[PDB]
Amino acid sequence: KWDYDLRCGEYTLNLNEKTLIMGILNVTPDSFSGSYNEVDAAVRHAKEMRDEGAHIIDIGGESTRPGFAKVSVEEEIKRVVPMIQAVSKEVKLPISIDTYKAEVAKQAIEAGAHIINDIWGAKAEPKIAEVAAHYDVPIILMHNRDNMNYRNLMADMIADLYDSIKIAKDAGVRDENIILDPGIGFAKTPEQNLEAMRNLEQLNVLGYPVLLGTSRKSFIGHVLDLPVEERLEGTGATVCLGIEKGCEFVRVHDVKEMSRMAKMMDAMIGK
Amino acid sequence: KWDYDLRCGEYTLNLNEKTLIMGILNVTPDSFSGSYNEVDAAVRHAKEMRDEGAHIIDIGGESTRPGFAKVSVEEEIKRVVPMIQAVSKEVKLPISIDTYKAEVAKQAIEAGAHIINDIWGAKAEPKIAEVAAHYDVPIILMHNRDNMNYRNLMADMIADLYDSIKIAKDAGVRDENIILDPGIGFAKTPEQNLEAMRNLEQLNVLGYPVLLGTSRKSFIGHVLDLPVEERLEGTGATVCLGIEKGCEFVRVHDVKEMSRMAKMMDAMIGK
Ligand SMILES: C=C1CN=c2nc(N)[nH]c(=O)c2=N1
Ligand SMILES: C=C1CN=c2nc(N)[nH]c(=O)c2=N1
């Protein structure tokens, strides 16, 4: 199916043999504070996920709360750089950096990170694509927008995704460095979120690997009527349908559980 | 989609609004023994499953071990009848009887059970279809066979299923009383089991509701390489793909978990 491999510095990801699991490592400060406690705790969680079946570590320090502190750019670099340096040293796994800021990604790669995960799809700081250009890394372009005016959800999603790919390409990014994401949980009502799930397969005609990020999200809450810590089965279900719909990556909190489900789908869908 | 409802005595099952969960109640004696302990324990488990989201209780006393006792027909009636009588009295839910024996089903319905679940698809005791005829109950016809010679798995499965439907129809069973089951885990290698999963959708052209029974099965074990008590995620995955492939029933051990997954799929597939 894919006639190429995802090239990340010393690591090489195969897009055909199995659904690739991206482990979420949330590194967002809950107060102003680098210290051993945090970095150490991030490493052990990364190690856990590696043990549990993860193929990628997604380090993000921009989660949007509640309970998280507002962090300025130069502050996020000081916080997120040490995290990257230690994890990539003790956890032999490619790391993505979950940011939409250009100067953050720059420093994250320099500090040893391999993939950019942009939740704004180069739209917030188009500069980020140039950083993606230079260091020649894979960049994940997520569907997002600043409003919810959709004529036709899927058609508009695909349009926005292409506007992103354009910015990427014009800055220098090769096709083989581009991953797409429907941005489930972003600027979509619970109903649109469902629709986008139901119609994921359409993104495949763009010709890029697709990554899905639905782990624990509110729309699962809305359907199942369940708080964030009780959305494993919901998440599960989304991961299954996402894989049946042709996704190549899933970005999840429950690496152990999700990994077995991804494995069971791969067998069934014949991956 | 379905222009009718599944009619079970006092209960009425809608085949369009949600994937219907069948709770497994295993009532197979592990030694020669009716007594309060057993019947009481079966009731509390039935109640649990009702609380957990089950829409049907499948009482079977013919599970094939290891550790279960060989039980003669007149012995199984004495054991399984009390179970039925108590459960249907204290658990307001339709009950199916998991047998391929004709005289068992007869007595099970008489004792208050609403659906027949035949793992041999009327092939073992065609008489069973006449019992299904008389009491006018829904009967589940499972794919099964006494050998593994398949020219073409799906085509042969569909053929066998029709041979079953024929026996059913000739004995008197109405179309609206027929449910089909691919018999995952029966006379199928782990590879065929997967194939049958991957191609489930084909059974839909027969025009009957399809029930899926994959809970905890060995082929999940073989893929995931995990013992029977660690196949929740595997099972999950099968249930998801089964629903995406158009199933209307799932027959499972982990009612709580599976119910949330079924619920999340229904939302996504728009049921
Ligand atoms: C909550 C988040 C934060 N970052 C994400 N990044 C990607 N790529 N996809 C997501 O769904 C996602 N959700
Ligand atoms: C192990 C069992 C016992 N009875 C069953 N009955 C049905 N209908 N389907 C199954 O998959 C099944 N598995």
From TrEMBL, chains A, B:
GO terms for cellular component: cytosol. The keyword rRNA processing does not apply. InterPro entries: DHP_synth-like, DHP_synth_dom, Dihydropteroate_synth-like_sf, Pterin-binding_dom. Its EC number is 2.5.1.15. It catalyses: (7,8-dihydropterin-6-yl)methyl diphosphate + 4-aminobenzoate = 7,8-dihydropteroate + diphosphate. GO terms for biological process: folic acid biosynthetic process; tetrahydrofolate biosynthetic process. Pathway: Cofactor biosynthesis; tetrahydrofolate biosynthesis; 7,8-dihydrofolate from 2-amino-4-hydroxy-6-hydroxymethyl-7,8-dihydropteridine diphosphate and 4-aminobenzoate: step 1/2. GO terms for molecular function: dihydropteroate synthase activity; metal ion binding. Catalyzes the condensation of para-aminobenzoate (pABA) with 6-hydroxymethyl-7,8-dihydropterin diphosphate (DHPt-PP) to form 7,8-dihydropteroate (H2Pte), the immediate precursor of folate derivatives. Belongs to the DHPS family. NCBIfam families: DHPS. This is Dihydropteroate synthase. It comes from Bacillus anthracis. The lineage of its organism: Bacteria, Bacillati, Bacillota, Bacilli, Bacillales.
